[model samples]
Target: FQSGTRWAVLVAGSSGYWNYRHQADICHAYQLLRKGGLKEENIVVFMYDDIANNYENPRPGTIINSPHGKDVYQGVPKDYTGDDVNVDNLFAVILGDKTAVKGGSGKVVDSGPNDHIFIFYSNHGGPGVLGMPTSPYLYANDLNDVLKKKHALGTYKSLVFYLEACESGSIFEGLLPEGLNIYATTASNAEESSWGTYCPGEEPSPPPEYETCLGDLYSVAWMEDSGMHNLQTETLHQQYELVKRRTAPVGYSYGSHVMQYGDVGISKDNLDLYMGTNPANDNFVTNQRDADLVHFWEKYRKAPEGSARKTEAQKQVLEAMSHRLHIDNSVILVGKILFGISRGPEVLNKVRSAGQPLVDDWNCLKNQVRAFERHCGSLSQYGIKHMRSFANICNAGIQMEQMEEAASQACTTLPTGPWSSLNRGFSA
Candidate 1:
């Protein structure tokens, strides 16, 4: 018999209809936890909360995770939304520090010593950073420190984390130490991309009215399995195996390497301790780099020809492309300035040995990114794809002054428009 209460923190770190899959994933998670008997008070939710009524949504006020799924958004608590869905609040929620939170419902975990904690985060990610709807992305070092602090405070009996993002493994690869009573699983390894599923034009696609992806691959895999299994009878390892197999089948081109880190021994424990135990592609699989573009193209394709909506959608597509190009060119230019043209690309594209951390000094990685963005422009969601290059720059031991110089040389004038530094704040 378990006496511990189950506490959960669900976060969708991206906003907008283009990233609909993330919030949809979180809503589904909320429903699953609620059904498993977790109380609303104990489960804190964080999402941008813009998808349900967005102008782009074909079905207003409804969000689904599958072609034939219930509305997961119906009763989801908006503990944090819009500008409040950020890294600071996330750490505060996990740490159960209500005073540290800013805006929104101000609901933290507030678990007791005998409680269990479950955290799920879905969003865009680079090598060592997790995207948020607001500025100042979540860094692994900061998150790990929070976890360490939580452990030091002795608030929970155990904790489990499920992360869905590109290069998600890097968040825990070498930073999370053992014996913390925490278990983590990521949608992809440090160097790969996690995929979006039920996207436009894919098999098992959402209704034709929907132009955006319905869910992420790894998220749905585990959620679907959880909905069908008995939490009291199923061990955490069993679920991990099922999710890993479904998320990345052998020989699948779009599949990613699902990874588990931190305390592996805890896998033997049944999930009831976390959920309370009640019951329960082609693109088909699209990479994060092209997810926004896919949404824009689909919107443009479905809009009436020669209509204002069509023209606006076309403009969005072009803007997305332009942003991607600018980021790529700027990163390549930074590489060139730092290591010359020939060696620059090589060094920037270098992948460290398996199990190696993204960079030796996590602070250096954060500082390097901050400097680049400070001089050039915001990385935006599109620029997250270049985070690995930023990590490489840090690994190469380039001085922050040199990075600032390179950024200035690469981008002579600060970017304007959506990718500009001025627009680098919270997103709706």
Candidate 2:
């Protein structure tokens, strides 16, 4: 899990309202992305579905609604657990109370320190309510206010508001902060009546793609248009522009407000290069290196996820999560200077037991990179960067290698236990 930031999304698929034409699709875009190699731990979904009659009833995806189903909380459907979008495969969520969620499905949703959030609402559309409807609406303004909390923490980066509800266009406005690229693509304004399911005939034998009675046209456009309709772009503005026009011809009007934000103009291929660190102690590795070496033939190695590492991509992702170390700047000065750049909180506890107070907190976002250079010799931004790179060389393949090393090096500069691993390689 080397991705610097964690990503979580909440999909409110309000399928049923008073009228029958209203229909919003459940959040499957997350599944689409996850299927493309996005780690489950990195991306989580809080999908709300009123599974009352499968898709006919409306249930709030928030913890407030569908208090009965755990699967619904994680956005997992009752019937299809092992299918594409299972939150169980990802993080855990404290649904708190109530759950109609089909058995064996619950997501791990960690609040605050939030990195990215996506809010998707689909259902009957009326006048401007923001994320609102008639009685229980996500008030376009209120929902944006709530979502903005994540951005304020300096933890948030990207926000995507996909509204299938009325006045969805206003969904993205004002919610975004400077440097925060927020995108909103809504159906129509408050007063405008958004169109719904309308096949060539009243009942032209459900389309080949739709399973139930009839699906809405706007949702269908987004789902089927993965290639052309859903064009991938670095800028939130461009992506919204592409999807907006594509879904327009369907008679469902939509617009977008986007904020361009990211690691744009990012110069270094690897943070190591930007930080100016050497790749490895090619000729100067201390004996500690030998002491911590991992031998496949020994008991230290264990296979993870029941999957054997066989591919290059898999091997690269599984490397020791050093980049995270560099990012966190967990370096501790014990007698001689043992820099712990990227250890989790648990590791800090173990170090405390050994009687060492964590003195330096070198978060890449806060402390200057040179602050680290002052302590360690022959150190550079790239070196710490290289440490990050090399530490997680085979992170994907041998998850144990990292864990095992953490344990082996616990008393050493690691200043913590083995589980003190950081998130580094787990991103898109």
Candidate 3:
């Protein structure tokens, strides 16, 4: 989260696994991240609700949020089938079925910097639960402890944890004292019933939160508070105070309350002289932060809401990059990039002055040229079978373009180079 930019993310929603309740809350969180400028790939959502409607067969719009904002099983008869599902409930197909460990979006969260984790849990969040059911469920300590391990690996710098379950706010109580920068918010001080009304099939639907009683109330108010003001975590908390007062004014309890904690990037309303000191790190993760500055060095690209979701073309492109291992291949033996889309104005300016990186790899480049000849010369035979062996500096230039395009489609891009430069393949 540097400047006005947001890095990686993971958004999860769990409802109806056993009783079918928390899903509407999940959708509320989804709307927030999407409106907040995070890309879909950066966000991997796991939703559980209405699997029974199309149990043997998941119908398109019959799964998660009904056209009315009510749970799919709301008044569904005992008998259900493929007829319930349709292209309309596409969101269900993605976040629901994909919750499976080996299947679904689980793969995305385990894979990278998924730094910002937005979770909305409407089901019971037990003491030692982490992953999905029937699967490994880790306690909050267990979860954050592992995240800390990944952090030590320099995985992500910023994170946001949002929970809408009983006792969820205190989950990370003692797990994250390591000085990592993150903000965690919880929906209630206790497990309260989450309720909302439903009206099916509205085009584009109600602004997400309108479906759940408690969820809709809190989410709309929260988003309005958060969105209307460019305030930080503290300010939002204070806003919640005002929100709590105004609600129930008619004298009846609607049955919901929310609270949040941790730090938000910046805000001004509550300029507390109470600014807490950041935790200190003893590991290599933060120590080398300056050296590992990730700079995209390109003008930002924006698209319409219709074009914002991940496209098949983008998926195909990322697939090609992963298969190539282009960046992973190059980071093996060099730290300085000679040619790259992200060469940066700083690097571009350096050509007129003193330069950087070892120039020694140049002399032996001819050896690589000879290797190319040996590999390509045999093209009709052995070389043709494994010509990448003769590939010219294999993972540079065009390969980077290819990889960059794929990553960019996901809305995150990497420059040509390596994270490690001593163990590349010729030797991969």
Specify the highest-TM-score model's number: 1
Encode model 3's per-residue lDDT on 1-428: one tens digit a residue. Answer: 23222332222223222222244444544444454555554444445434434232223343343333433333222211222211112223222233433433232333234333333333334221222321122235444554555456554445555454433433444334435555555444322322222221123243242222223333334443443443333453465465454322335534345544444441122311111111221111000011011101000111233442225324433543443344333332122233344542233222111111111232233234233322212111111112122122332332433323332342232332232122212211
- Write candidate 2's Cα lDDT for 1-428 as tens digits: 33344343434323222222222234344443343333455444433233334432333342111112122125433322222122222212322111423343444334333344444455533222322111122333344444454455454444455566443443343333345445455654322334344221224332232212223444434443432222222233443444456545434533222122232332112221101122222210001011112211111223343444323223423332343343334333221122244443223222211112112221221122222222222121112222222222222122333333442333333322121222211110
Superposed Cα deviation of residue 139, candidate 1 (Å): 0.7
Q: Give me the overall lDDT of model 2.
A: 0.32
Return the number of clashes found in candidate 3: 22
Rank the candidate models, highest TM-score first: 1, 3, 2
Best model number under lDDT: 1
Measured over all alpha carbons after superposition, the RMSD of each candidate to the real structure, in angstroms, is 3.5, 25.4, 23.5
State the local distance difference test value for candidate 1. Answer: 0.86
Candidates ranked by lDDT: 1, 3, 2
TM-score of 3: 0.40
TM-scores, all candidates, are 0.96, 0.39, 0.40
Sum up the clashes in candidate 2: 63
The better candidate by lDDT, 2 or 3, is: 3
How many angstroms is residue 82 displaced in model 1 relative to the true structure, after the best TM-score fit?
Answer: 1.2
